[PDB]
Design a protein around this ligand. Structure first.
Ligand SMILES: CSC[C@H]1O[C@@H](n2cnc3c(N)ncnc32)[C@H](O)[C@@H]1O
Ligand SMILES: CSC[C@H]1O[C@@H](n2cnc3c(N)ncnc32)[C@H](O)[C@@H]1O
Lengths: 230, 234
């Protein structure tokens, strides 16, 4: 039987996913997270929000894999735009992710890099193609790009520019790279989707609040459409 | 069940921090690969010991600790390795036990959260009072000086006056490193007692890279020797 993990960082990112799938869920508490286990179209789905940031999201991903045996992980949630052509409510699949706050430059390493790892983490080529196929099939605009993930909420042009020049990222968030990383370590196909809710600038906290619902819904509905195709 | 053979997890971040541990215990270890890590499993004084280095940084250490707990059933986690000093009385080679830890690079202040704070969590993470007390007893017994304090963890190697100043100011931390808070965090989430031990290898300032390289093996040995002394009492 197929087992799919479905992740958000915040409760508001998973509420619409629980509603849209519509089925009964069993709540299973583990490691401070609540996993919702259900059956949908023959597939077992396990849904949780990690809580914000890289440690919470690493922990939740690793639990989904080791404790619930998921064979794929789909992540949905909101992000800040780093570049002028990514506008509020746009949807983006991350083709590669980076931990933008990693700095071992004292030992001559480039920013983002840790020994025994890589700067850019890859997501699943087959699931990214599925995302593209579903967006096409539905006439949805789906952007692709690099997402930078770090443990700060980015709200300044100074940091925005650094992210774009250093890592060529298009959007910034606090969980994608860690979720993708954990899945690579365990050989689990991963897809990370984000909807834009802010421009990661002085006004980002206001915009984040005004568009959280609409942006979380946009990302949630697309994830469901992918699962309908798996 | 607490009546079963006890399983202890012992963690470092780099291979050099666990090489002396495997040697000090001196028993046969089976190597088990999982999640990009190698776990070394042995039996020592009628307890099962599971030893691994996570690789550097918060993501690597969160994943490895979650594996030790979930895949290996550890019931206590002890962490040993090296750290940078933030205070004058913590000198190269000195031992520190972390009473609390903080993720010093967490910043959601755009929403007026205090630095280090994440919604639905807390700034400071606690470790095991009983294990910390055993460390203090073991230090006394073995004659070693053992400092107690706050450890700040983040995903940057700190090597500046200005960053050390901020860590002292904001968090009153005594040392800095890249894994402790994430290990203690995962342990607290699963209800597993955790002790974080560090030996100083550098002063977290402009020459920190050179001092780190010079003292990695010696400081890792000091921390490993102390961790073994702890296990010999459990
Ligand atoms: C309340 S902290 C921000 C949350 O939304 C995502 N996010 C949205 N916009 C941004 C931004 N500008 N910088 C960092 N994270 C963001 C993050 O992944 C985190 O879960
Ligand atoms: C090589 S990156 C530094 C490694 O040693 C620890 N460490 C020692 N000194 C420091 C320092 N000054 N800043 C950050 N981490 C340090 C960290 O936990 C990490 O595994």
């Amino acid at each position: 039987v197929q087992k799919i993990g479905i992740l958000g960082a915040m409760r508001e990112e998973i509420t619409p996913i629980l509603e849209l799938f519509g089925v009964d869920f069993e709540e299973i508490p583990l490691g401070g997270n609540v996993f919702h286990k259900g059956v949908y179209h023959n597939k077992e789905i396990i849904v949780a929000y990690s809580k914000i940031g890289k440690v919470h999201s690493t922990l939740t991903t690793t639990s989904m894999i080791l404790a619930f045996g998921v064979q794929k992980v789909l992540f949905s949630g909101v992000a800040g735009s780093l570049v002028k052509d990514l506008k509020i409510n746009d949807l983006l699949v991350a083709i590669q992710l980076v931990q933008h706050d990693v700095d071992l430059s004292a030992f001559d390493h480039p920013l983002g890099f840790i020994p025994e790892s890589a700067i850019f983490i890859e997501t699943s080529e087959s699931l990214n193609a599925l995302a593209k196929e579903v967006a096409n099939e539905q006439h949805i605009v789906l952007k692709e790009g690099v997402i930078a993930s770090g443990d700060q909420f980015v709200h300044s042009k100074e940091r925005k520019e650094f992210l774009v020049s250093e890592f060529k990222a298009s959007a910034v968030e606090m969980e994608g790279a860690s979720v993708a990383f954990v899945c690579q370590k365990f050989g689990v196909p991963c897809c990370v989707l984000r909807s834009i809710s802010n421009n990661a600038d002085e006004e980002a906290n206001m915009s984040f609040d005004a568009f959280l619902e609409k942006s979380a819904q946009t990302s949630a509905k697309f994830l469901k459409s992918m699962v309908d195709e798996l």
